[PDB]
Amino acid sequence: AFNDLLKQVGGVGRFQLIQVTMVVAPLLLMASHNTLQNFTAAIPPHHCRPGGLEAWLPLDKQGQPESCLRFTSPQRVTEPCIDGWVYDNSTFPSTIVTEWNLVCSHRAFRQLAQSLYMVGVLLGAMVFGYLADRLGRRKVLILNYLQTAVSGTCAAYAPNYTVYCVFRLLSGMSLASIAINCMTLNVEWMPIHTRAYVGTLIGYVYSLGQFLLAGIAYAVPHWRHLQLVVSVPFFIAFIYSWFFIESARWYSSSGRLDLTLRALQRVARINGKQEEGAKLSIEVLRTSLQKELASAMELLRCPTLRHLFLCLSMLWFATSFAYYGLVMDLQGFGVSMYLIQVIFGAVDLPAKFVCFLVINSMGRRPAQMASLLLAGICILVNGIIPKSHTIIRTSLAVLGKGCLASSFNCIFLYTGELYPTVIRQTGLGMGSTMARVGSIVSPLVSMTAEFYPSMPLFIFGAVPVVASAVTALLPETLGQPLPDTVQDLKSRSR
Ligand SMILES: Nc1ccc(C(=O)NCC(=O)O)cc1
């Protein structure tokens, strides 16, 4: 086995701490990149460029000047803003909306940019996932840091909308690969009893990145500068990424025992176990890993695994879809986006606390049902309540966000414990893929706000309810042994 060798080198030592810290720092800006559009694509008050200004702008039901209509003659005929729009610079001096007039007839391009970024995220999670099996995790991480820095800066200096969208897609690809491969590298470089802690640290760093986004966006309001400042740190990340030590587990699995010994020797030197490291040798590693040394297409051939795959796909998709639909709408609560983003980042700790309590006490199925159902109801009620109730709608949005984060944690644990070990990792990958698909589709649904203002909220709230209903089909895994083969699945089912 490899666990004994990993323990011998020093376990969680200086190298492990330094590597995990320096490989997990980029997840601080992961959230900034995921939800940058809330600030770089903010929609300020606007009206057509012309008895004064009021005499030219037609009025609406609420009495505000019409956003995209203008009187042909002074005051009755209205025309679109052929002369361009007059935006408000008081709070949002410049965003991609004001830069490229992504308003009214072109207001769906704002959502299409996010959809393309998430399509890039999915594409990266697949392509770089395949590549890391060939070039290793360290090379892929270096390339991802370089790509993210380059694409982010290029988007910050994009001269037109298509270039911005292309570079946002590429940066999403690189960031998705970063997220996928950080956990893999750190898990392969850590013992078996610390991988859950690694995942917990990933969650915490994402929660902290949510705070960081609000802080940075408040500091620098202009969108070009904001994108530049949230994108350039990946240059430093790339610079120090050359010093990473590649996972010895991958080296061994790739049939390079000399490289495995060299990596373990270096880890011993850093961890201070040179004397124990010198004991290791090619013959020892071979005699230890001789023992260690199914496909995703059986998830559909065998009905017993097929049912689980389908249900978990629904669950993952619903969680991601509702989550991103809810969190990409911070400007619709009538409260300052900085405060809302701060509260959204803060609400992630009590959410996971309650989630942990519920899973340990009741089980996984009740936890998943409760999380999804409560998020759906919260979003639906948010849709029903009038927009003039800023405080109540903000509170309900925060509650739904916390519920969706709890659902994310619960679904990860449940899909981990549901599949047999023969096809467990494939199932986890497929579930994450469906989550990425949901994140891709959320902006598409949000594009419908142009016609029906509240339809996006209704769909975002309705999908989790159906997913919670679907959760009732899965079995309970609390206080049960982890299955190892499909025969174990049949035994559990009967
Ligand atoms: N607050 C969170 C948001 C997203 C995720 C996640 O892992 N999504 C899968 C993907 O789309 O890559 C986890 C926590």
Side-chain angles (χ1 to χ4, degrees):
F2 194 87
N3 221 15
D4 51 312
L5 311 179
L6 207 157
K7 309 235 153 194
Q8 155 155 18
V9 193
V12 187
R14 159 161 146 178
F15 149 81
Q16 304 279 178
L17 300 177
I18 293 172
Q19 179 118 333
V20 300
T21 296
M22 293 328 228
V23 182
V24 85
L27 292 323
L28 290 174
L29 296 163
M30 182 74 191
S32 295
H33 282 269
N34 273 344
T35 74
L36 200 53
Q37 300 252 114
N38 280 320
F39 300 100
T40 58
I43 306 165
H46 55 282
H47 62 77
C48 289
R49 203 195 301 291
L53 192 82
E54 310 182 358
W56 279 81
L57 322 183
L59 278 293
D60 63 348
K61 301 182 183 181
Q62 288 184 5
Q64 287 319 79
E66 204 66 321
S67 302
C68 288
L69 273 162
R70 153 181 71 133
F71 282 138
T72 60
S73 304
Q75 306 300 292
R76 168 159 287 98
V77 193
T78 64
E79 87 205 44
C81 311
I82 64 101
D83 258 346
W85 283 265
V86 162
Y87 299 86
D88 210 34
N89 59 348
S90 84
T91 307
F92 302 114
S94 98
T95 70
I96 64 159
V97 157
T98 82
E99 185 88 28
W100 306 318
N101 291 288
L102 306 173
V103 289
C104 288
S105 324
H106 289 355
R107 76 175 87 186
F109 284 130
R110 187 176 161 279
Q111 277 77 235
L112 185 74
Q114 174 73 26
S115 207
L116 288 171
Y117 174 86
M118 287 296 160
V119 161
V121 161
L122 170 85
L123 267 183
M126 306 207 339
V127 159
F128 284 108
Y130 173 95
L131 271 173
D133 286 33
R134 314 280 261 201
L135 309 180
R137 285 77 164 131
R138 160 174 184 285
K139 262 160 181 94
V140 169
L141 271 183
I142 296 158
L143 294 171
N144 299 160
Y145 292 132
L146 175 61
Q147 178 172 338
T148 306
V150 170
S151 285
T153 310
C154 292
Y157 288 135
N160 42 68
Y161 168 82
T162 309
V163 167
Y164 168 92
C165 272
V166 161
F167 284 120
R168 280 282 289 178
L169 185 142
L170 293 171
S171 82
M173 257 185 93
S174 66
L175 281 153
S177 176
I178 277 147
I180 290 264
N181 282 124
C182 168
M183 89 84 48
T184 296
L185 193 84
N186 282 342
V187 163
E188 281 188 340
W189 259 131
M190 277 271 191
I192 277 175
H193 77 264
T194 310
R195 301 170 176 193
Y197 284 108
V198 166
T200 284
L201 195 276
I202 287 166
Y204 281 33
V205 81
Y206 197 129
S207 202
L208 257 292
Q210 288 188 92
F211 277 108
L212 180 60
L213 172 54
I216 299 177
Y218 182 69
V220 56
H222 300 76
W223 81 268
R224 282 188 187 287
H225 300 144
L226 167 54
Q227 178 111 45
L228 185 79
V229 301
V230 306
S231 283
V232 295
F234 281 88
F235 277 126
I236 300 177
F238 157 80
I239 281 162
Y240 72 59
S241 169
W242 293 91
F243 293 70
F244 291 173
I245 307 190
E246 152 71 338
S247 97
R249 216 303 177 209
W250 176 78
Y251 276 142
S252 325
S253 58
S254 63
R256 301 283 280 137
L257 267 296
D258 48 307
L259 272 298
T260 298
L261 197 186
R262 186 217 56 201
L264 289 167
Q265 175 30 294
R266 277 169 65 41
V267 177
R269 306 215 195 93
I270 305 159
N271 287 358
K273 295 225 95 78
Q274 317 96 315
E275 302 180 355
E276 284 79 329
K279 195 274 303 189
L280 291 160
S281 77
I282 301 308
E283 51 267 73
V284 173
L285 272 52
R286 157 172 44 265
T287 321
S288 324
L289 285 320
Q290 81 297 32
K291 184 179 181 180
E292 309 220 45
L293 297 179
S295 60
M297 232 51 62
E298 203 71 353
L299 285 176
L300 301 319
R301 214 144 277 99
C302 202
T304 326
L305 263 160
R306 195 200 315 160
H307 311 342
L308 262 56
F309 167 55
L310 297 166
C311 303
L312 282 164
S313 311
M314 284 90 132
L315 291 169
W316 277 98
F317 175 92
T319 311
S320 205
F321 172 87
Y323 176 88
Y324 271 105
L326 162 60
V327 304
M328 289 300 325
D329 217 298
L330 300 182
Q331 204 165 358
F333 302 123
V335 182
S336 164
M337 266 172 321
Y338 316 120
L339 256 165
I340 304 162
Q341 173 75 20
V342 163
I343 296 161
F344 268 27
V347 85
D348 250 338
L349 296 316
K352 54 79 141 167
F353 189 67
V354 171
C355 201
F356 286 19
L357 300 194
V358 174
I359 302 138
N360 308 140
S361 96
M362 326 225 285
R364 269 96 207 161
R365 231 211 296 191
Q368 193 78 69
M369 292 201 264
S371 296
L372 276 171
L373 209 176
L374 264 61
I377 276 173
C378 275
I379 298 170
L380 278 168
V381 173
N382 224 24
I384 277 193
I385 293 176
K387 307 253 175 302
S388 167
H389 291 328
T390 59
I391 295 157
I392 295 95
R393 276 185 83 237
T394 316
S395 310
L396 272 166
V398 172
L399 236 174
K401 159 61 185 323
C403 298
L404 290 158
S406 316
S407 173
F408 262 122
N409 315 117
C410 193
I411 189 58
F412 188 135
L413 252 70
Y414 202 7
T415 181
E417 292 158 8
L418 262 158
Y419 281 106
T421 205
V422 80
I423 220 174
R424 170 155 317 120
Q425 285 304 137
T426 306
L428 274 89
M430 283 284 231
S432 262
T433 290
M434 305 285 342
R436 272 168 239 132
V437 172
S439 51
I440 286 159
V441 172
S442 287
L444 297 183
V445 158
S446 162
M447 281 168 200
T448 57
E450 193 162 331
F451 325 128
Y452 322 86
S454 281
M455 181 174 201
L457 276 166
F458 298 137
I459 295 139
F460 296 146
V463 171
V465 171
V466 185
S468 93
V470 153
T471 321
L473 289 132
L474 303 176
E476 188 63 84
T477 62
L478 166 68
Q480 285 249 12
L482 270 90
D484 281 300
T485 78
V486 183
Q487 211 54 229
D488 312 70
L489 259 292
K490 278 153 183 166
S491 75
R492 150 186 276 173
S493 178
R494 290 152 193 172

